[PDB]
Design a protein around this ligand. Structure first.
Ligand code: CA
Ligand code: CA
Ligand code: CA
Lengths: 253, 253, 253
C-alpha cells in the first residue's frame, strides 16, 4: 500500500478528477461523469496566486491555473519539496597468469556497472476538503455510484525524474604455446561490451540531451535544474487520491 | 498492451479523431463519420494559448492550433517532457599466430558494432473529457456504432526520434610457406566491411543531415536540439486513444 | 508515545483540521465534517502578522496565512527553533599476507560507511485554545462524534529534513604459486562496490541538487540554509494534535 501513485496517464491525471478505484488500480482510469462542486486548490510554492478556485475540474483548467500561479508576482521556485538520490557503483576484476615445451594463459576479466536513480519534487497542487463533506454537487451521486468505488485525485506533484544505467564488460584471453621442430601457437581474444540506458522525465531540455556523454551529463542535468523556473515548471510525476465517501486517504496496492 | 501508440499514419493521427479499435490495431484507420461536440485541448508547454477549443476536430485545425499556441506570448520550449537514450557498443577480436620446411599462419578478425536509439518528447496536446460524458454531439451515435468499437484519439505527442547502427568487420589471412629447391609461397587476404544505417524523425534539418559523418553527427543532432523552438515544433511521434463508451483508456496489443 | 507526528499526508496535515484518532494512527486521516469556530493562529518567528485568524481551517487558508505572515514587515528568519544532527562513521580493515615450491596469498578487505541524519525546525504555527472550550461551533457535535475520537491538529512545524548514507566495499585476493618444470600460477581479484542514498525534504533546490557529489553537497546544503528566507519558507515536517473533548495533548503510539 502506497499513498503516492506514479503518473502513468498524464491526460487523466489531473486534480479534481473522479475515477473508479479498480480502474485506477489496473490503469484503466474510467471517469465518473457527475457534476462536482467548485474545488479550492493550493500550491506548495510561495506566490500571489497560491489559492485558486476551479469550477469544473479538468486538465486544461489545472494547467492554466498552474501557469497563472507560477507567472504571478512574488513567485519563488528557489525552494523545492523533495529530492531523492541513489547510486550503486560496482566493479569486478579477474586475472589469471598460468604458465608452464612451454605454455602460457593470461585471462583478464572486467565488469563495471553504475546505476543511478534520482527524483525531485518541485511542488504540489493540493485540493481542499469539501465544505459540505461531499465532492458531488447534487450530493446524491455518492449514493448513485454505490459499488463503483468513487475516488478523486486531490494532489498532483510536479517535479523531475532521472534514471541512468551504465554497464561495461572486458575479456582478454591470451594463450601462448611453443615446442622448441619449432612449432609455435598464439591465440589472442579481446571482447569489449558497453551499455548506457537513460530515462529522464522533465527538466531542462538542453541539459537533458547532454546526458548522452556518459556519467557527466547526468551530473549537470541535476545540478543545473535545482531551482524550478516558470519557464521550466516541471512534470506531473506523482499524484494522490482520496475516497469520495468519507474523504479518507485512498491506498492502492 | 501499451498506452502510447507510435504514429504510423500522420494524416489520420490527429486529436479528436474517432476510429474503430480493430482498424487502428491493424493500421487501417477507418474513421467514424459522426458529428462531435467541440473539444477542449491543452498543451504541456507553458504558453498564453495553452487552452484552445476546436469545434471540428481535424488535422488542419490541430496544426493551426499548435502553430498559434507556440507562436503566442510567454511561450517556453526550454523544458521538455521525456528523453530516452540507449547505446550498445560491442567489439570482438581474434588473433592466431600459428608457426612451424617452414610455415606461418597469421589470422586477424575484428567485429565492431554501435547501436543507438534515442527519443525525445518535446510536448503533448491533450483532450479534455466531455462534459456530457460522450464525445458525440447527438449522443445517439454511441448506440449507433455498437459493434464498431468507437475509439477517439485524446493525446498527441510531439518530439524527435533517432536510430543509428554502425557495424564493421575486418579479416586478415596471411599465410607463408617455404621449402628451402627454393619453393616459396605467400597468401595475403584482407577483407573489410562497413555499414551505417540512420533513421531520424524530426529535429533540425541542418543537424540531421550531418549524421552521415559516423557517430559524430548523431552526437550533435541530439545536443543541438534539446530546447524546441517555434521554428522546430517537433513531429507527432506518439499518440494515445480512449474508448468512446466509458471514456476509459484504450489499450492496444 | 510521542507528542510530534511526522507529516505523512501533506494534503490533510493542516492546522485546525479535525480527524479520528484511529484514522490518524493508521494514516487514513478520515476528516470529521462539522462546523468549527474561527481559530486564532500564532507564529513562532517575529513578524508584524504574527497573530492571524482563520474562519474556516483549510490547507489553502493555512498556506495563504503563512505566505502573508512571512511577507509582512519586521519579519526575521534569522533565528530557528531546533536543529538535530547525527553522524556515524565506521571503517573496517583486513590484511592477510600468508607466504610459504612457493606460494603467496595477499587478501585485503575494506568497508567504509557514513550515515548522517539532520533535521531543522525553522518555525511552527500554533493554534490557540478555544474560548468556549470546544472547537466546534454548535457545541453539540462533540457529543455527536462520541466514539469517533475527535482529534484536531493544533501545531504545524515548518523545517527541513536530510538523510545521507554512503557505503563502500573493497576486496583484493592476490594469489601466487610457483613450482620452479617451471609451473607458474597467478590469480588476482579486485572487487569494488559503492552506494550513496540521499533523502532531502525542503531546503534550497540549488544546494539540494549538489548533494550528489558525495559528502560535500550534504555539507553545504545545511550551512547555506540555516536562516530561512521568505523565498524558502520550509516544508511542514512535524505536527501536533490535541483531543477535542478536554483539549488535552493527544499522544500516538
Ligand atoms: Ca457537495
Ligand atoms: Ca455530447
Ligand atoms: Ca465553541
Amino acid at each position: 500500500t502506497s499513498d503516492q501513485i506514479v503518473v502513468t496517464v498524464p491526460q487523466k491525471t489531473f486534480i479534481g478528477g473522479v475515477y473508479n478505484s479498480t480502474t485506477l488500480d489496473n490503469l484503466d482510469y474510467t471517469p465518473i461523469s457527475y457534476p462536482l462542486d467548485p474545488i479550492t486548490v493550493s500550491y506548495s510554492f510561495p506566490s500571489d496566486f497560491i489559492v485558486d478556485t476551479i469550477e469544473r475540474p479538468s486538465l486544461s483548467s489545472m494547467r492554466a491555473s498552474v501557469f497563472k500561479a507560477m507567472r504571478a508576482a512574488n513567485f519563488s521556485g528557489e525552494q523545492s519539496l523533495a529530492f531523492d538520490y541513489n547510486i550503486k557503483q560496482f566493479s569486478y576484476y579477474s586475472e589469471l597468469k598460468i604458465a608452464f615445451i612451454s605454455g602460457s594463459n593470461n585471462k583478464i576479466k572486467r565488469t563495471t556497472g553504475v546505476f543511478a536513480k534520482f527524483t525531485q519534487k518541485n511542488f504540489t497542487i493540493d485540493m481542499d476538503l469539501p465544505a459540505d463533506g461531499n465532492i458531488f454537487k447534487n450530493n446524491s451521486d455518492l449514493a448513485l455510484t454505490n459499488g463503483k468505488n468513487p475516488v478523486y485525485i486531490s494532489s498532483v506533484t510536479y517535479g523531475r525524474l532521472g534514471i541512468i544505467s551504465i554497464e561495461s564488460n572486458a575479456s582478454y584471453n591470451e594463450v601462448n604455446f611453443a615446442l622448441k621442430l619449432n612449432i609455435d601457437s598464439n591465440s589472442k581474444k579481446i571482447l569489449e561490451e558497453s551499455d548506457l540506458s537513460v530515462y529522464l522525465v522533465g527538466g531542462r531540455g538542453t541539459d537533458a540531451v547532454q546526458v548522452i556523454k556518459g556519467f557527466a551529463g547526468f551530473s549537470n542535468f541535476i545540478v543545473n535544474g535545482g531551482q524550478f523556473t516558470p519557464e521550466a515548471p516541471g512534470v506531473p510525476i506523482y499524484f494522490s487520491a482520496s475516497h469520495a465517501s468519507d474523504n479518507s486517504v485512498y491506498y492502492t496496492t
